[PDB]
């Protein structure tokens, strides 16, 4: 479009810059793609543009890394099993100020750059929140000029591609590397050995881990550009490779696949613990290879290990990389021959742990038999850690035997296990939750004993989202009308959005905020037609719940509300209601029967609602297939209403909530996770808060939750349960939803019925405000204006000052 | 070196060409390798040079392929399971005239280009002769301006890397793609489906192959540059990929490995038949993907199929791609719905078959049960082919029932099999052997019945070697002293080497030929020290036997001779003998116990000979480890004597014989394969011919070979057998060589003892001529001078005119 090149926030199309970009595009098309414009497909054109844009990172990537070598600042290592990065082309162009120059260059070559962007595969190397947080954090650490390295696994297959067939989830391999990855640089020369199995012999010098099987770890380095500060940091992802040397010769060559299977695929369980050996191998693989890099980089700097914590921070994203603690002790004691006590002092000052959930089924509790087989030295070191840790508990709390049993790294039972969260707290100088309410819940419930031993360890770091991906990239319309009033500094100083409260009565801004949402809604609706032949009413309220499918997130409560709207229309057909397009999307874990049945119930409700001629365009319900970072960038800027309806106490933070607030949706939600802080920043008068508070949930748990009480007292609820139970939503198979009905009536841990009436009444308040466009938009302005706290720059600046001990900086390197 | 830049055959170092090469080298080092000269290793420098040289292919590669589209000449498809390509960097620089310019460019950057060349991995995608012939053929077809495409498999692992440990072969995976392949272009956009298993339903339109498992075939295209004619042809290698859509989700993602195992590794059996299902899958994979390309390319040209043979030749390199015949019939009949008879007329005019051995254990005879399971439609079509073929035999030879049984594609027995050689002859308009004697042996023995039915089918095409790789690349010294007298035209017109017979009495040339061999011997000896701490006497005769280890090649006869020289020294220590360095190298098939014992016997003989202080530097025996194309380019130009000592009738052609003749070694050999034609070209007076002729072997077979007769009549032979038997060469394990002794005495199919006395006497004639340097060199001149027939340009020109029906051309395209 002509209009989009006019957007100032997208930078300058310098005449020489355009000329060079076209020359380099054509050069890559010829020498890199080995095509000419005769045979070139849109995919060749995307790749020619990606190689051209990637060439602009290289000088800064080399200069940044040389700068870290020269200045020797403290290095931050962000260890994660997941980096939900999404696409790279737009992000690179935004962060290097090339967006308008590439748009003009490709326009002059007769190409639509927006069409080329849609060709790129997501780097879908995460499940959801925790993975996307890692991605926002790498972006913020680069923008803040930290010497920061993401370390993870280069999965051959990311989070599965979700197809919906017959209204059911089907899973397909996410072959994201099919056409190559133009961003990464293979570093086979920096390949490192990782050891498994074997046994411990305790010799003269001490212990020795021998008779191991070797898997090599080959690093692939991806650039991470800061926002217009010429900083380019590194994400290093390890790929598994069979060792050089060794059924027959042929079978031995094919058996190289077993070692290489370690980096084959992301576990799609959204943090729910499965105890798979292959998952333990992935966790050890990332930790072992990463810590060898850290130790090597430390020794080749301006061996004595007292300075190690002054030069190294290791941030553990959940317990997934918790083996970092025993592995660093193994390296320091067995290989560097430090005394246990010195090694432990170093380890604890180096390591910090971030907890992302209180849900007990998320907790990693590895069988000791599995650890003894796979990692015999690690289990010895863990027992030693536990003995010395519990000695300290006994000394602080003499005779508190119950506290010793509760705090032990070792869990007794049929199967003896190691609690990896207890290991993380024992081995870390800082433990943080990811929202104020969550960090308090840690100190009062699941880590109370640890808090009483070492209160100074416990911190809060409220999550955030990068305002580059989550406003400038995905919503350039909104970024522009904001820049037109307060300039561009807010893009890396998001608290400046508070200036927008000066505009709540400004006729032009009220007009502009509503026009941007309408433009976003027209574009998203076009898509739902062009690529899925699905019609949506563009004058309807876009009611959006997008996140992984879990009972705790209560997609089912949204289902009860949708059926309530259908049933109220059928009862009073002549009564006006605010038209709604209810959009639910998200992946279910491939096992999880209940999650898959919930997806089927959403599509089944659609089958009835969407074909009822009495309803027509007044209510539509659509399951958004294959929800992922790229789709989030499309639907979130188009949303009117943000569904954040987890049972109070279950969602640690959320980050999708923050994306919606930044992009001009109003929120309906419980007082859970960061929804509490979002309501506080904006004022509760500007949020649709409903339902039980954490205290209310605890009171119900104390007397026992009886779903029958709610069914017996709420006629509209009885009608819906009777429709699901009798087969109104599955006439060819009347018993289809019996398991959902049985769970809701008898085994509902997330108290869906207890929030049903407050939810429905809150949703009437949403409709009532939507009927007043001007007042809807003024409340939106009050939300966008107060979304600044939820920048990951704020979050990372807190990690840097309160945990890592490094001072952030927005000052530019040269180019 | 300063001297090597002076070599005119290596071309011009133009000042602007040098300037541009350095600029492009530095550009690739920065943008492609993402390094600077601070951290760059020799391997980064090799890759920067390879990308720079590869950029020079691209325009010509695109223009050549556009030219074939424009002119629509008949296309030649060379189908092979093997392309033994070796390294590409030097070959590319020679064929584009860039060698001196890159040498000067890298010299000016402070680098040694020869050192960078040694970093490149061989593309070791073959076993030996047949694979290397495919590689010489692609080079010759490009040099002759044919519209020719090599089609094969992109094996992840080529021919195993051979280590020698304890004097034994050990096999390691040839991870040739570890650091990437800068030559190939991945073409994932041109990926094609290949079908396996399933069943045939015979419907209204006719047969339909349904319920199949799909494996995708992803092509990788490698450039094949002609010699200074601006032609760049394509080698397309298929890689196996799991189909996009589908133990659990995780196991299903890991199970993608089973389909991908099809292209994992080259079968290392040097043509010996094993009947492995995975090998049958590889053969079908290459044929099915290739024939879809051929059919598509045919339909998109200037559907009617009568012109198909005028636009397509398919050359079958051995029976490995024999399924091309039933697959083309399947496509034409089942998918294009041609009548059987029209389809068959097309298939036979399209297909031709090259036979590479008479040894019955090489013959592919697939169980019908395996074909019925894997390829049910192919087996139906093969039976139909057989019925109609045998109908024709019955009509030509009425009542010859024995001939029907002998000629059938179907072999009866405990296990019913398909004879793939019989299928190839039935389905091909031409059948060729690879040397005059071999092609006659085919018409008189194993294909006599087929010859009597269709004599016009049977041709000879004597093998050849490319004089680019096998003289200009590997022996620039020799190429230069030749160019100094007759100019450069001989490099693509090798018959011009006959001009050198004018120089047999030229003092300067005699001096120069001997100086080049000495320079080659000094360089090879340096290597045997620098990279293996092995000392060799540079004034010794370099006696070289390099080829795959097989009983038929009689490395054991060479062993008997070496022990004879040792025993004669010990008996008369004071008697002068011509010092020898006896070098034997080659890979044994990983199964093949006897081949592995023969390697151990060579190293064991070395252990005694090389440490006997009475022998000292008068006799040394070394096993050259990991013999492969790159090592052949080093040892062959250094050789004095070429060992070509196969039992008469067993070696179809040989090509290593031709390499040695071209590079100034004299030959000791039997009248076998192309040794016969080499002796004819040079004159037998200029070859060390010995032993039984084919007629002599047949006479022995008629009365029965009794090794005992030879043992009883030859004292020197008895002494050696008694040394092997008693444990003289294995004192710590006296019975080590009992199996070799038992085979030689009782089960020797290759009549080693029958050629022993003539071999030893012939070797005395070699020593006697070596004592006269001037006469040795004059006989070398007479060999090099007559080596011109053995150019693969001569061979390919015969294929083009006598089988493919296309006229070759050495005329230049524009650049
Ligand atoms: O459906 C349209 O886009 C799709 C939806 C969409 C969105 O909701 C937000 C966003 O950030 C990008 C976005 O890209 C989508 C898209 C898909 C394509 O296949 C494509 O070629 C393209 O240009 C784009 C569309 C229709 C239009 O009529 C149009 O003019 C346009 O620019 C775009
Ligand atoms: O051993 C030397 O080379 C090795 C043997 C050899 C050969 O026999 C023929 C040939 O075509 C090339 C060839 O490359 C070998 C080689 C190996 C290396 O590791 C290397 O760095 C190199 O420059 C080369 C050598 C010694 C020398 O003293 C010397 O000056 C030289 O140029 C080379």
Author numbering:
A (entry chain A), B (entry chain A): 7 to 252, 260 to 315, 324 to 836
Quote the original article.
Κinetic experiments with rmGPb and rmGPa showed that EGCG potently inhibited GP Ki = 49.8 ± 1.6 μM for rmGPb and Ki = 46.7 ± 1.4 μΜ for rmGPa, hence having similar affinity for both muscle GP forms. The QBS is located close to the protein surface about 15 Å from the active site, 43 Å from the allosteric site, and 32 Å from the inhibitor site. It forms a groove constellated by residues Lys544, Arg551, Lys655, and Tyr548 on one side and by Glu120 and Glu123 on the other side. Upon binding, EGCG makes a total of 107 van der Waals (vdw) interactions (14 polar–polar, 39 nonpolar–nonpolar, and 54 polar–non polar interactions). In addition, 2 water-mediated bridges with protein residues are formed, namely, O02-Wat1037-Cys495 (O) and O03-Wat1134-Asn541 (OD1). Aromatic rings A and B are positioned in 4.06 and 3.20 Å of positively charged Lys544 and Arg551, respectively, forming cation−π interactions. The gallate group (ring D) of EGCG forms 2 extra hydrogen bonds through its hydroxyl oxygens (O37) and (O44) compared with the nongallated EGC, with residues Tyr548 (N) and Glu120 (OE2), respectively. Superposition of the binary complexes of rmGPb-EGCG with rmGPb-EGC reveals a shift (RMSD, 3.31 Å) of the Glu120(OE2) side chain upon EGCG binding due to its hydrogen-bonding interaction with hydroxyl oxygen (O44) of the gallate group. In comparison to quercetin, EGCG having an extra ring (ring D) forms overall more vdw interactions (107 compared to 63 for quercetin).
